[PDB]
Amino acid sequence: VNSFSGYLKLTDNVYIKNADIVEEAKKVKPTVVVNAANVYLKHGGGVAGALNKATNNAMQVESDDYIATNGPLKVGGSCVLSGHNLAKHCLHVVGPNVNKGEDIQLLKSAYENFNQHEVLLAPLLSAGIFGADPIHSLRVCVDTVRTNVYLAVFDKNLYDKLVSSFLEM
Ligand SMILES: Nc1ncnc2c1ncn2[C@@H]1O[C@H](COP(=O)(O)OP(=O)(O)OC[C@H]2O[C@@H](O)[C@H](O)[C@@H]2O)[C@@H](O)[C@H]1O
């Protein structure tokens, strides 16, 4: 469980590896995988789609059940659903969607949810479909999260860019 290998240490609690998050979840057996979600837990085309695919759509049903009972999340919030065959738990976290005019400051609120979990495997919130700059998302991650976060960046060119950007310390 939580057997992370091959990561680059960026800070005492932020680690980064060039890897697909769904394949890492399977090799590492993490307690908490982070989904980059929207407030209706409708799992579209990024990390959320891939996690859902790997659970054979179980995440989507469970999500709708959760949404039916509880209603939609706030931007910058989270919920703890099941991780199914990927992890013990899946932390659904809703970053701001800047393509839809939401406030980038809420990215800090989004990453604060990580601090309720000792250890997580996560992607870079809001950095794909939601339109935030990956480098910014990484900066907020570094400055906000205090627990152990292992970041999976599947694009080798973005990994290289991200690391180079972090060295402007
Ligand atoms: N399989 C993957 N593994 C690792 N990183 C990934 C993967 N797919 C995408 N990424 C990276 O994770 C970051 C977040 O991308 P998204 O998943 O699109 O996250 P976000 O921008 O928060 O989009 C939220 C929206 O996407 C929908 O899937 C979701 O339902 C919500 O509507 C980006 O750097 C993206 O390149």
Author numbering: 3 to 171
From the primary publication:
Severe acute respiratory syndrome coronavirus 2 (SARS-CoV-2) and other SARS-related CoVs encode 3 tandem macrodomains within nonstructural protein 3 (nsp3). The first macrodomain, Mac1, is conserved throughout CoVs and binds to and hydrolyzes mono-ADP-ribose (MAR) from target proteins. Mac1 likely counters host-mediated antiviral ADP-ribosylation, a posttranslational modification that is part of the host response to viral infections. Mac1 is essential for pathogenesis in multiple animal models of CoV infection, implicating it as a virulence factor and potential therapeutic target.
In this study, we determined the crystal structure of the SARS-CoV-2 Mac1 protein bound to ADP-ribose. Our crystallization experiments resulted in the same crystal form (needle clusters) from several conditions, but only when ADP-ribose was added to the protein. The structure of SARS-CoV-2 Mac1 complexed with ADP-ribose was obtained using X-ray diffraction data to 2.2 Å resolution and contained four molecules in the asymmetric unit that were nearly identical. The SARS-CoV-2 Mac1 protein adopted a fold consistent with the MacroD subfamily of macrodomains that contains a core composed of a mixed arrangement of 7 β-sheets (parallel and antiparallel) that are flanked by 6 α-helices. The adenine forms two hydrogen bonds with D22-I23, which makes up a small loop between β2 and the N-terminal half of α1. The side chain of D22 interacts with N6, while the backbone nitrogen atom of I23 interacts with N1, in a fashion very similar to that of the SARS-CoV macrodomain. A large number of contacts are made in the highly conserved loop between β3 and α2, which includes many highly conserved residues, including a GGG motif and N40, which is completely conserved in all enzymatically active macrodomains. N40 is positioned to make hydrogen bonds with the 3′ OH groups of the distal ribose, as well as a conserved water molecule. K44 and G46 also make hydrogen bonds with the 2′ OH of the distal ribose, and G48 makes contact with the 1′ OH and a water that resides near the catalytic site, while the backbone nitrogen atom of V49 hydrogen bonds with the α-phosphate. The α-phosphate accepts a hydrogen bond from the nitrogen atom of I131, while the β-phosphate accepts hydrogen bonds from the backbone nitrogen atom of G130 and F132.
